[PDB]
Design a protein around this ligand. Structure first.
Ligand code: NAG
Length: 504
């Protein structure tokens, strides 16, 4: 008798709703970018299925005396039932002796339900502590504020729209108990933004964290190298990076690593900073398949991924400048080597030096050898039509986007391409494709075919394998097309920045 959404089952509203209900549902989406109305129907003690593999219950054995953790949850104008459901999932599914304090860090909310109402509600839970930021500061500063209030040996960071699952905590703390330089993440499961349905997979499908050369986090499957280290896919696996929202760390080790770079602005990337310094300054980073936490997955694209201005640049530049050695150049190519103002980084350099950290080359060689380095490609940079000043140009959404041509601007971004050994014209994981209609950009599949191109050096033509046609610019200079190949047609002549035959 768990009510709507019990055992993580979906809650669906009726097709027909009164106008007052419709206003309530729409209001919920406006405020939260998820369906707050259905969350409000679902118990804040909503039961969930046990998502763990049999290995996690029958074969995994954890140290008897685990260190206590504080759980730090930062929020800004979170919905009442969603914030409460997070906190109760922590209280109800974690052994009491393993929780120090649940520290709720209010990053300057203005909604009334988060003020006195929130204090009164948790007054009867002595483990819950509310910290009020004095101005709006963003996630990094709120998390550091939380860490400074924390007294337990381990910090566990969650966000405000999570649901812990059965047995989530012990596997994380066991790794830190064995070696306090180990940083750990639960497997992050999907809670639907529409129905709040909870979804879990077995440990066979575990993904691990990487990054692309735009310095954005990305997921990849456990590489074969790492799978060969384990007898069961349920064992914790090394991860080059963490997504950042959910992890545990020894409190002193976090401070030793310099927590987060407080010179970052609010637009993220501190997950990558912490990942890099964990591996190259004496620690390890694991994803722990026996530990699941559900997380409300908003399908709506957040502002930072579609901004008209590059809000990601400052933190990416500070990251590259402090931690990436000579490899920073590949990110700088992506932004046209226009680094902007990234502030003062000298204290972070002193931090890295004082910790005697390893090189970024060591990190790439040893932790993330699967990452392809753009300098090893046949060509990288702009792809320019010789007789004029038009460049191959595309908005890269990870969907099929149209590929066109625009005046070369020398700023990277939409005009940055790589020519791979396999004949792909690509940016990150999207490949130039032609199937007889329009030239498009979609996910690289590694099968050549319609994604196979050759640069014909003596004519400077971009020749397409399966069609036998050549990439060209219309004589009105405003449309990209595929046409019959012809030597001497200047409209079919392209130059590829950094083209190097020796690389194929
Ligand atoms: C803990 O892990 C770090 C990083 O792998 C390693 O340098 C250290 O020797 C380990 N400590 C113990 C006691 O195994």
């Amino acid at each position: 008798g768990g009510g709507p959404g019990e055992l993580g089952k979906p809650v669906r509203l009726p097709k027909e709703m009164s106008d007052e209900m419709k206003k309530a549902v729409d209001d919920g989406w406006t405020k939260n970018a998820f369906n707050q109305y259905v969350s409000d129907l679902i118990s804040v003690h909503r039961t969930l299925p046990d998502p763990r593999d049999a290995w996690c219950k029958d074969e995994a054995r954890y140290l008897t005396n685990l260190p206590k953790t504080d759980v730090i949850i930062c929020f800004h104008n979170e919905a009442w039932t969603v914030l409460l459901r997070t906190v109760h999932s922590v209280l109800d599914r974690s052994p009491e002796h393993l929780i120090g304090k649940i520290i709720l860090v209010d990053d300057y909310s203005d909604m009334p339900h988060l003020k006195r109402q929130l204090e009164d509600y948790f007054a009867a839970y002595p483990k819950v502590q509310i910290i009020r930021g004095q101005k709006r500061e963003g996630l990094i500063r709120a998390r550091i504020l939380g860490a400074n209030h924390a007294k337990s040996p381990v910090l566990t960071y969650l966000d405000s729209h999570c649901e812990c699952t059965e047995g989530w905590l012990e596997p994380l703390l066991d790794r830190i108990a064995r070696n306090s330089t180990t940083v750990v993440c639960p497997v992050i499961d999907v809670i639907s933004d529409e129905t709040l349905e909870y979804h879990y997979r077995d440990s066979g499908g575990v993904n691990v964290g990487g990054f692309d050369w735009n310095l954005q986090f990305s997921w990849h499957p456990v590489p074969e190298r790492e799978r060969k280290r384990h007898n069961s896919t349920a064992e914790p696996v090394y991860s080059p990076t963490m997504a950042g929202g959910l992890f545990s760390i020894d409190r002193e080790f976090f401070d030793r690593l310099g927590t987060y770079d407080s010179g970052f602005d609010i637009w993220g990337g501190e997950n990558l900073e912490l990942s890099f310094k964990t591996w190259m300054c004496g620690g390890t980073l694991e994803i722990v398949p026996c530990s699941h936490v559900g997380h409300i997955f908003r399908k709506r694209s957040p502002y930072k991924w579609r901004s008209g201005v590059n809000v990601l640049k400052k933190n990416s530049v500070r990251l590259a400048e402090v931690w990436m050695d000579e490899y920073s150049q590949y990110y700088y190519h992506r932004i046209g080597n226009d680094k902007g103002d990234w502030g003062d980084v000298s204290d972070r350099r002193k931090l890295r030096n004082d910790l005697k950290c390893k090189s970024f080359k060591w990190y790439l060689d040893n932790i993330y050898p699967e990452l392809f380095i753009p300098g090893d490609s046949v060509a990288h940079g702009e792809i320019a039509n010789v007789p004029n000043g038009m460049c191959l140009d595309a908005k890269e959404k990870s969907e099929e986007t149209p590929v066109s041509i625009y005046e070369c601007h020398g700023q990277g971004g939409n005009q940055y391409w790589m020519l791979s050994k396999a004949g792909e014209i690509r940016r990150d994981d999207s490949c130039l494709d032609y199937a007889g209609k329009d030239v498009t950009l979609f996910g690289c599949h590694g099968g050549k075919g319609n994604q196979f191109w050759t640069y014909r050096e003596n004519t400077k033509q971009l020749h397409h394998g399966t069609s036998g046609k050549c990439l060209a610019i219309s004589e009105s200079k405003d449309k990209l097309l595929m046409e019959e190949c012809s030597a001497s047609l200047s409209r079919q002549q392209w130059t590829l920045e950094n083209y190097d035959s020796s690389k194929l």
